[PDB]
Write a protein that binds this ligand. Structure first.
Ligand SMILES: *[C@@H]1O[C@H](CO)[C@@H](O[C@@H]2O[C@H](CO)[C@@H](O)[C@H](O)[C@H]2NC(C)=O)[C@H](O)[C@H]1NC(C)=O
Ligand SMILES: *[C@@H]1O[C@H](CO)[C@@H](O[C@@H]2O[C@H](CO)[C@@H](O)[C@H](O)[C@H]2NC(C)=O)[C@H](O)[C@H]1NC(C)=O
Lengths: 48, 48
C-alpha cells in the first residue's frame, strides 16, 4: 500500500499539465513578488 | 567674459539646493524607471 498509490497519475494529461503549471505559477508568484513606496516607486522590496 | 559669468551662484543657498536635488531626482527617475506587462507583472523592463 506504500507503493500502490497512483498519486496524480489518474488525471488526464491536459488536466495534469494544467495543475502542474498552476502550481509552478503560484510558487513563482510567491517567490518573486515586489511592493514599493507610494512616493519613491523606483525601488521596490522583495519578501524575504 | 568667459570667466566673468556668475552661473547659478546668484541663487540663494536653499534655492540652489532645491534645484540640485530636483535635477538629481529627474535624472534618477529617467535612469531607473521601468514598466511591465499587465498579465505577468513579475518581470519589468527598463528603457535602454
Ligand atoms: C491505480 O491505477 C490503476 C491502473 O492505473 C487503476 O486500476 C483500474 O481499476 C479499475 C477498477 O478496478 C479497472 O476497471 C481499470 O481497468 C483499472 N485500470 C485502468 C484502465 O485505469 C486504479 O484506479 C488505481 N488502483 C488502486 C489500488 O488505487
Ligand atoms: C555676481 O557678480 C556680480 C558682478 O559684480 C555681483 O553683483 C553685485 O551686486 C549688484 C548686482 O550686480 C551690483 O550692483 C554690484 O556692483 C555687485 N557687487 C558685488 C560684487 O556684489 C554679485 O555679487 C555676484 N554674485 C554673487 C553670488 O556673489
Amino acid at each position: 500500500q506504500a507503493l500502490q498509490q497512483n498519486g496524480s497519475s489518474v488525471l488526464s494529461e491536459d488536466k495534469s499539465k494544467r495543475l502542474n503549471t498552476i502550481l509552478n505559477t503560484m510558487s513563482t508568484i510567491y517567490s518573486t513578488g515586489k511592493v514599493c513606496n507610494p512616493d519613491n516607486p523606483q525601488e521596490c522590496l522583495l519578501l524575504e
